[PDB]
Homo-oligomer: A and B are copies of this chain.
Amino acid sequence: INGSKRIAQPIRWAMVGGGRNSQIGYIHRSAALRDQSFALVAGAFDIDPGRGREFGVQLGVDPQRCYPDYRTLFEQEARRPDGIQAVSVATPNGTHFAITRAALEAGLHVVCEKPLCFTLEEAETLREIALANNRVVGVTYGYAGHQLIEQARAMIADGELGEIRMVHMQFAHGFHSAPVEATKWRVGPSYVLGDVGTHPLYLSEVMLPEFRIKRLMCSRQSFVKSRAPLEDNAYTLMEYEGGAMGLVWSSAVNAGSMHGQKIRVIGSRASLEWWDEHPNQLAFEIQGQPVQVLERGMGYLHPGALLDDRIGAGHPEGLFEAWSNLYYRFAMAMDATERGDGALLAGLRYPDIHAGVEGVRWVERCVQSADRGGVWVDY
């Protein structure tokens, strides 16, 4: 990657949410504006119209296209020949469904934050409106943009681990060990299952695209009792079709842990393990051989895992590179749709409406199991 243009002109783009004091607003813009993928021309940046406009102007947005709310954004932009083509939804979880639905009905492509929405019926309603209106829905499972996730997928498909036996996933941080705005709204049918567990779950779907969950059980806890019934800790044990096992540990009360997102795929011959805090390395551990570390950008990687390198091996890339790798694919997908290039659109892989639906499905089944005291449920 050298900043060459992927599409003829940047997608005309807005955000809803991601305002001045938001945790995630900035990485959406840093990734979307990079390499001429998107141009930020409008937004409803803040729950408060006045702060949305002040912030919007500082981002270089036309003051008149800093709108009080998503409805006004979609209505007013529809009247302009240079109106937005796509919107990123970076609001709290409870508004994802309504905003995404409104954007799709207005004929806009959408990038929606995870978890996509609360219920599986909402998720499949967004999917059917997206399909009817021929719109791209991206979902910011940002960690999936790291090159070594593709390396892992390519190695598993090539049989380098032998027969897959176990998938061990965690996203277990300590930032909510204590009863500490962003946290207030998080504390919806779930907290950490949707907030963090869905991340390495989606990494498992990228690495093992043919794996199907047969049944699962989930035991969830509110260690900070005032969060009940929202869980700040959960254990999900899964049986895949064919007899492989999966385990997801979701947590916001793993005291001392800075992030702790890890995925270990264990085969008959070898394991791989990836850790989000050191995203440029992939452990590759053949039983009976010295353990190995695979590095981003090295010539021994599969060709697919080298495509998105922005600097030579040994220079650390980070999560902004991963997000940039998703956003250029989002832009290529939206552009392909506008030009009616069904061929390009068919060859692209990115976290899409189907990834969003599967994350919502998984949370729903975990909550069903957990509310019943951690019993097996059919997936």
Interface residues of A (CB under 8 A from B): 1-5, 20, 22-27, 29-30, 33-34, 36, 55, 58-60, 161-162, 165-166, 168, 173-175, 177-178, 217, 219, 221, 223, 233, 235, 237, 239, 243, 245, 247, 249, 253-259, 266-271, 276-280, 283-295, 298-300, 310-321, 373-376
Contacts and interface: CB of A to CB of B under 8 A. Distances in A.
A243 B271 contact: no
Interface of chain A, main secondary structure: loop
Contacts of A253: 165-166, 266, 268
A287 B2 contact: no
Given A59-B4, A166-B233, A321-B320, A271 B221 contact: no
Residue among A247, A269, A288 with the most chain B CB within 10 A?
A: A288
Contacts of A291: 256, 258, 292-293
A239 B374 CA distance: 11
Contact of A256 (B237, B287, B311, B313): B287
A10 to B, nearest CB: 9
B285 A256 contact: yes
Contacts of A286: 255-256
A290 B288 contact: no
B268 A165 contact: no
B259 A315 contact: yes
A289 B293 contact: no
B318 A317 contact: yes
B277 A280 contact: yes
B290 A165 contact: no
B285 A295 contact: no
Contacts of A30: 3, 34, 310
Contact of A29 (B3, B20, B217): B3
B271 A266 contact: no
Contact of A221 (B221, B243, B277, B294): B243
Contacts of A319: 311, 315-318
A172 to B, nearest CB: 9
A203 B135 CA distance: 49
Contacts of A278: 278, 316
A290 B285 contact: no
A113 to B, nearest CB: 14
A161 B249 CA distance: 20
Residue among A3, A25, A317 with the most chain B CB within 10 A?
A: A3
B177 A269 contact: yes
A373 B285 CA distance: 31
Given A23-B312, A233-B165, A300-B290, A270 B258 contact: no
A270 B245 contact: no
A177 B373 CA distance: 33
A257 B289 CA distance: 10
Contacts of A178: 268, 287-288
A305 to B, nearest CB: 13
A317 B27 CA distance: 11
Contacts of A292: 290-292
B374 A373 contact: no
B23 A1 contact: no
Contacts of A280: 277, 318
A184 to B, nearest CB: 15
Contacts of A29: 3
A300 B289 contact: yes
